[PDB]
Enzyme design. Sequence first.
Site, PDB file in Angstrom:
ATOM      1  N   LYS A 220      34.235  38.134  13.669  1.00 38.94           N
ATOM      2  CA  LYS A 220      34.918  37.890  12.442  1.00 38.94           C
ATOM      3  C   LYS A 220      34.146  38.199  11.152  1.00 38.94           C
ATOM      4  CE  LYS A 220      35.283  34.491  15.018  1.00 38.94           C
ATOM      5  NZ  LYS A 220      35.228  33.473  15.823  1.00 38.94           N
TER       6      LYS A 220
ATOM      7  N   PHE B 174      21.145  40.049  16.640  1.00 36.94           N
ATOM      8  CA  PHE B 174      19.885  40.193  17.388  1.00 36.94           C
ATOM      9  C   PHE B 174      19.478  39.002  18.282  1.00 36.94           C
ATOM     10  CE2 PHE B 174      15.652  37.751  16.106  1.00 36.94           C
ATOM     11  CZ  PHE B 174      14.946  38.379  17.123  1.00 36.94           C
TER      12      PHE B 174
ATOM     13  N   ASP C 172      20.684  36.272  23.522  1.00 43.61           N
ATOM     14  CA  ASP C 172      21.445  35.011  24.059  1.00 43.61           C
ATOM     15  C   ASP C 172      22.132  35.501  25.303  1.00 43.61           C
ATOM     16  OD1 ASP C 172      24.030  33.313  24.015  1.00 43.61           O
ATOM     17  OD2 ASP C 172      22.335  32.088  23.741  1.00 43.61           O
TER      18      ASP C 172
ATOM     19  N   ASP D 149      21.418  33.869  28.946  1.00 47.59           N
ATOM     20  CA  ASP D 149      22.688  32.805  29.412  1.00 47.59           C
ATOM     21  C   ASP D 149      23.182  33.653  30.725  1.00 47.59           C
ATOM     22  OD1 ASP D 149      21.728  31.128  27.698  1.00 47.59           O
ATOM     23  OD2 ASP D 149      23.529  31.674  26.273  1.00 47.59           O
TER      24      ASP D 149
ATOM     25  N   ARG E  56      31.498  39.664  25.386  1.00 53.87           N
ATOM     26  CA  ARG E  56      31.277  38.993  24.090  1.00 53.87           C
ATOM     27  C   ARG E  56      32.187  39.927  23.182  1.00 53.87           C
ATOM     28  NH1 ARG E  56      28.518  35.081  21.349  1.00 53.87           N
ATOM     29  NH2 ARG E  56      26.599  35.308  22.932  1.00 53.87           N
TER      30      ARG E  56
ATOM     31  N   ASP F  12      17.220  24.904  23.996  1.00 57.50           N
ATOM     32  CA  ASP F  12      18.582  24.942  24.793  1.00 57.50           C
ATOM     33  C   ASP F  12      18.027  25.556  26.259  1.00 57.50           C
ATOM     34  OD1 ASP F  12      21.424  25.776  24.842  1.00 57.50           O
ATOM     35  OD2 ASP F  12      20.602  27.291  25.687  1.00 57.50           O
TER      36      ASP F  12
ATOM     37  N   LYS G   5      19.547  25.631  17.160  1.00 59.77           N
ATOM     38  CA  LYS G   5      19.870  26.787  17.705  1.00 59.77           C
ATOM     39  C   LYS G   5      20.983  27.230  16.800  1.00 59.77           C
ATOM     40  CE  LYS G   5      23.434  25.840  21.251  1.00 59.77           C
ATOM     41  NZ  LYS G   5      23.771  26.027  22.708  1.00 59.77           N
TER      42      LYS G   5
ATOM     43  N   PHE H 123      30.325  22.794  14.451  1.00 59.76           N
ATOM     44  CA  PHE H 123      30.815  24.246  15.106  1.00 59.76           C
ATOM     45  C   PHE H 123      30.417  24.275  16.610  1.00 59.76           C
ATOM     46  CE2 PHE H 123      31.959  28.523  14.290  1.00 59.76           C
ATOM     47  CZ  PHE H 123      31.218  29.133  14.917  1.00 59.76           C
TER      48      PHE H 123
ATOM     49  N   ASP I 187      32.056  25.111  20.156  1.00 64.23           N
ATOM     50  CA  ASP I 187      31.643  26.207  20.759  1.00 64.23           C
ATOM     51  C   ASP I 187      31.503  25.692  22.192  1.00 64.23           C
ATOM     52  OD1 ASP I 187      30.675  28.997  21.073  1.00 64.23           O
ATOM     53  OD2 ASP I 187      28.873  27.960  21.900  1.00 64.23           O
ATOM     54  N   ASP I 188      30.871  24.454  22.491  1.00 64.07           N
ATOM     55  CA  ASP I 188      30.857  23.985  23.844  1.00 64.07           C
ATOM     56  C   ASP I 188      32.100  23.719  24.470  1.00 64.07           C
ATOM     57  OD1 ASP I 188      28.190  24.378  23.350  1.00 64.07           O
ATOM     58  OD2 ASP I 188      27.844  22.218  23.138  1.00 64.07           O
TER      59      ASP I 188
HETATM   60  O1  LIG Z   1      26.562  28.336  23.756  1.00 64.33           O
HETATM   61  P1  LIG Z   1      25.325  29.556  22.913  1.00 64.33           P
HETATM   62  O2  LIG Z   1      24.591  28.499  22.376  1.00 64.33           O
HETATM   63  O3  LIG Z   1      24.820  29.996  23.962  1.00 64.33           O
HETATM   64  C1  LIG Z   1      26.319  30.538  21.934  1.00 64.33           C
HETATM   65  O4  LIG Z   1      27.015  29.790  21.032  1.00 64.33           O
HETATM   66  C2  LIG Z   1      25.333  31.397  21.196  1.00 64.33           C
HETATM   67  N1  LIG Z   1      24.173  30.806  20.216  1.00 64.33           N
HETATM   68  C3  LIG Z   1      22.846  30.962  20.282  1.00 64.33           C
HETATM   69  C4  LIG Z   1      22.321  30.293  19.575  1.00 64.33           C
HETATM   70  N2  LIG Z   1      23.414  29.555  18.803  1.00 64.33           N
HETATM   71  C5  LIG Z   1      24.465  29.984  19.266  1.00 64.33           C
HETATM   72  P2  LIG Z   1      27.618  31.532  22.664  1.00 64.33           P
HETATM   73  O5  LIG Z   1      28.652  30.545  23.263  1.00 64.33           O
HETATM   74  O6  LIG Z   1      28.158  32.414  21.700  1.00 64.33           O
HETATM   75  O7  LIG Z   1      26.918  32.200  23.969  1.00 64.33           O
HETATM   76 ZN   LIG Z   2      25.305  31.996  25.119  1.00 64.45          ZN
HETATM   77 ZN   LIG Z   3      28.587  28.822  24.161  1.00 62.66          ZN
HETATM   78 ZN   LIG Z   4      22.609  30.430  24.618  1.00 66.71          ZN
END
Ligand SMILES: O=P(O)(O)C(O)(Cn1ccnc1)P(=O)(O)O
Ligand SMILES: [Zn+2]
Ligand SMILES: [Zn+2]
Ligand SMILES: [Zn+2]
Lengths: 343, 343
Positions: free
Chosen positions: A50, A91, A96, A100, A105, A167, A193, A232, A236-237
């Site tokens: 976005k 990057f 990530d 993970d 994505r 993390d 993070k 935010f 995301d979680d």
């Molecule tokens: O949940 P993550 O922190 O791994 C994530 O939000 C990416 N990220 C990594 C560092 N900050 C955010 P994504 O869900 O996009 O895989």
């Molecule tokens: Zn992730």
């Molecule tokens: Zn996430």
């Molecule tokens: Zn992550």
Amino acid sequence: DVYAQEKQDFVQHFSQIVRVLTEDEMGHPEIGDAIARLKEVLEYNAIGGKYNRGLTVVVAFRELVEPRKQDADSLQRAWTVGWCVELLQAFFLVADDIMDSSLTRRGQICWYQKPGVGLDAINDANLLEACIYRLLKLYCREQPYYLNLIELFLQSSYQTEIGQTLDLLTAPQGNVDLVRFTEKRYKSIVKYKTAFYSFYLPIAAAMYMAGIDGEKEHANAKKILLEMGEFFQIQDDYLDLFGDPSVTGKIGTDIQDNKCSWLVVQCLQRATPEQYQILKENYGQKEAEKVARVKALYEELDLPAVFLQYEEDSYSHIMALIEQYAAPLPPAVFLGLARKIYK
Amino acid sequence: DVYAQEKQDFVQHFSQIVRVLTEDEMGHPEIGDAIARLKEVLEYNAIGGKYNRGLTVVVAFRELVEPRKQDADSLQRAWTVGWCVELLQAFFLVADDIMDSSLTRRGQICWYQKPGVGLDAINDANLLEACIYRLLKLYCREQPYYLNLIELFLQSSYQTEIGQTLDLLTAPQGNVDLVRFTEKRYKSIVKYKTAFYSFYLPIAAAMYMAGIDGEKEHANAKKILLEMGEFFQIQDDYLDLFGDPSVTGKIGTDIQDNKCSWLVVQCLQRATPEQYQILKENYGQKEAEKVARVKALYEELDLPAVFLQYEEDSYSHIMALIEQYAAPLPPAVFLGLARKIYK
Ligand SMILES: O=P(O)(O)C(O)(Cn1ccnc1)P(=O)(O)O
Ligand SMILES: [Zn+2]
Ligand SMILES: [Zn+2]
Ligand SMILES: [Zn+2]
Ligand SMILES: O=P(O)(O)C(O)(Cn1ccnc1)P(=O)(O)O
Ligand SMILES: [Zn+2]
Ligand SMILES: [Zn+2]
Ligand SMILES: [Zn+2]
């Protein structure tokens, strides 16, 4: 709104970014294959999102710099720095996704999962980072804020990496202990993070371009922006499990990856001893049935309602922070950002 | 010699490097676990090598800076920048070991192969890189060469990553074509992946600290240093197969990884059509017996003798280059380096 009326201009200038990152080495034919690979990496990983983080640089710049100073050259630099923020993001996200073990994505398969890519994606990621500093030198070297930007981008990367370390340390695979998953630990992780690079970085960059370099002004902006960033990441979680995949563009992995998610943290605060046991025996494992069991436990504890309530309260708290800390900056700067992430 | 009489001082100051990279965040208790991980990463990956690249910064600095300017503060900065070069190295090597699927380095198991580490080593690598710029700011921010160093380190990283991209593109796993393995392609790969950071970077850094910032002086130093770096990498390829493991500290993987090695390139130049077929059918594969077959082909073509002859001629060529390009710099600067890598 102000984003949407900046967006298409922003996107259109990605071609010049790719042009200049490719022709910067015209005088070096021998690296043509590497430069072609870089182009492919850019086009697959910097495009398709976005661009909110990069657009924030542009929007804030127009709101912070006096119009009679917003010439063609200055705007070009503003959306170059915007794209640098998008490159930093790319990057981190490529790495990530490897760490993970994610699958998708932005609605496509993760770069490293592409046949032919694999762990070579690690070097691809580092190249995207290097591009940031290639662009800053190409476009901003002669500017008074040049060193401020270089240091902002390097510092933001360090912070984000500290965050990623927290993390990953807190989420040992095959090793489930829920005792680590506290509210205090959670807030620290997402501050580092996510909050720095996603919210402080873009606004801070525009600020420095506007000649606003004061420690006091940056600390005040940071009070608002780090809190937004915390919300935010909680969002995301939430969406990692309850989000709509065709909207999010990515498949969630937090439960399988044993992550210190905002969800699991709120679950721990609410679960009976019996529910705790259920969480303990199903969390952090790859089996679909065990993941489903965790999700059922979340829904049984009405975590979706808890999130919806938290989002309203967070919104109010952040607006309070803007009343307190926005000056001397235009409040629109923080409001536009708040509008993008809240509903 | 001049290295050996600088070495132990250099090594001893690693503790202050680790101290300051750990206490720089005293005011931030919440990241303690990340900082402890960083310490562990530093101690496992920046320590245990020969430190030749970092020592070169120190040695060159003492030879380039007038003694009455070599105060305690200036020396401290010199071996800080030396350690930054060692950190850049560590950054690249941790990632390189993942991407080459290597097993050991510096006589120990590769960081990423350690139980509990795995692909988290990707973020560990990025942290080592960030440490470079944390040290440059901590020790050099107020110096006139500050920006020159930042840009030298960023540029060197970009070049090395271009090199790694060429290295990986030319070595597709499961896809053997020997036609890619040319002398012209080889020289390009090692120039970028090794020569810049291992030889230009350290001397250039010391030069900038000595106030030697002239484009002409750097281009002349670079004529010598990039050629040394080409020889050093050819030597690295030779030792990957014919080196003594207890001396090299690492197990070779070039044949299994299908690499554009100096060895395979020289083999291609010399092989009969029958031998070409043997190479084609055994190269780039994980089977020990097929690797042994390649090695036998190399020995049958007396590639070890070809290397020993090439090393003598390279030495002479490089000494010629030093006669031509060393001035106005002390020749000892390049001679000491040449002495370290030739026998
Ligand atoms: O949940 P993550 O922190 O791994 C994530 O939000 C990416 N990220 C990594 C560092 N900050 C955010 P994504 O869900 O996009 O895989
Ligand atoms: Zn992730
Ligand atoms: Zn996430
Ligand atoms: Zn992550
Ligand atoms: O042979 P590589 O280029 O992979 C190597 O020399 C590392 N490297 C990586 C970039 N330049 C050098 P190493 O044998 O130490 O694994
Ligand atoms: Zn290697
Ligand atoms: Zn390699
Ligand atoms: Zn090697």
